[PDB]
UniProtKB/TrEMBL annotation:
Species per Swiss-Prot/TrEMBL record: Chaetomium thermophilum (strain DSM 1495 / CBS 144.50 / IMI 039719)
Signal peptide positions on this chain: none
Molecular function via GO: guanyl-nucleotide exchange factor activity; translation initiation factor activity
Subcellular localization: Cytoplasm, Cytosol
Name of the protein: Translation initiation factor eIF2B subunit beta
Keywords from the UniProt entry: Cytoplasm, Initiation factor, Protein biosynthesis
Cited SUPFAM superfamilies: NagB/RpiA/CoA transferase-like (SSF100950)
Length: 328
């Protein structure tokens, strides 16, 4: 019924009931975007905790199967797959004291041993994985603030900043910047007053706000200093998944030498190349921005260029967990 209600039935509901409730939320689309990322992490944590497995191989299978089901419910949401792969990667990492000693190792692996009083080895790994998943959850929750901590670096006094259909991440970024900078924000949407709350918050902070006519976006871009977008996803090639019409704004910015900045947390980094459907823009209307149109990827780790992306992907993903689509 609600994500909040779903969250606290989690620990005293059956695993299958929790998975099915979340599936229900995803399909009715009550749960959307980045709060979806956290929901996946919490459900996967419960899978690690409550499902039956004795070896990492069966733990990996469990997580992947549950992840596949969740992904299926909301195919439009690519962050779900990212969280699943991050959890799969975490499991492999921790899988690699009592285990090094032959005596204790043998004792721990036995289901009928006085250490199993589920063999000990399973329990120790289970505990460590659940902890790591909590960390992933904290990484997800803190991403917007971490991205916003670089705002003073990105925005300078007197800047004219064009924000195209700002998301929550962009809002937190602009509001934070307002605390340390005096500048102007231009809110433009090609899809047609809007963003009254955001504007009210910005104005109180000392930031001027401009509303642009739909027709004028192309005429007015030469004025602005920089263009900022929230990315729904990032791809290995440096392409982005964005709101519809963003690609047009990106090109205009590029045409007039205006830096294009994409706000994206690493959890939104998809370890694939963009599907042809995405390139077509077919993938709730989204557009695709090719890497040539993007100047900066601003992440929780800081601003990055396309050349920096390979390192980031390698740091967070395992080759075994990528290169295939989750499927039940």
């Amino acid at each position: 019924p609600s994500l909040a209600t779903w969250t606290k039935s989690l620990r005293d509901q059956s695993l299958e009931a929790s998975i099915e409730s979340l599936i229900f939320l995803l399909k009715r689309r009550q749960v959307t975007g980045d709060e979806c990322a956290g929901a996946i992490a919490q459900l996967l944590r419960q899978v690690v905790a409550k499902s039956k497995w004795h070896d990492v191989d069966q733990l990996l299978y469990r997580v992947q199967t549950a992840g596949a089901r969740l992904a299926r419910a909301a195919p439009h949401e690519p962050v779900i797959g990212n969280i699943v792969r991050r959890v799969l990667g975490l499991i492999r990492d921790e899988a690699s004291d009592i285990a090094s000693d032959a005596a204790s190792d043998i004792q721990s692996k036995s289901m009928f041993n006085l250490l199993s009083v589920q063999p000990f080895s399973v329990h120790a790994l289970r505990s460590e994985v659940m902890d790591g998943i909590e960390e992933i959850l904290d990484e997800i929750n803190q991403a917007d603030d971490q991205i916003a901590s670089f705002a003073e670096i990105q925005i300078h006094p007197g800047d004219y900043v064009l924000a195209y259909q700002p998301s929550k991440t962009v809002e937190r970024f602009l509001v934070k910047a307002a605390s340390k900078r005096r500048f102007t924000v231009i809110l433009a949407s090609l899809n047609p007053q809007p963003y009254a709350a955001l504007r009210k918050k910005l104005n109180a902070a000392g930031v001027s706000t401009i509303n642009l006519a739909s027709n004028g976006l192309m005429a007015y871009i030469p004025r602005v200093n920089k263009v900022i977008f929230g990315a729904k996803a990032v791809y290995q090639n440096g392409g982005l998944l964005v709101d519809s019409g963003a690609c047009i704004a990106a090109q205009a910015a590029h045409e007039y030498l205006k830096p294009v900045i994409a706000l994206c947390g690493v959890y939104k980094f998809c370890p694939e190349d963009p599907s042809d459907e995405v390139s077509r823009g077919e993938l709730t209307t989204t557009d695709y921005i090719p890497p040539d149109l993007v100047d900066v990827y601003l992440t929780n780790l800081g601003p990055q260029t396309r050349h920096h992306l390979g390192g980031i992907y390698a740091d967070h993903y395992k080759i075994e967990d990528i290169g295939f689509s989750l499927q039940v």
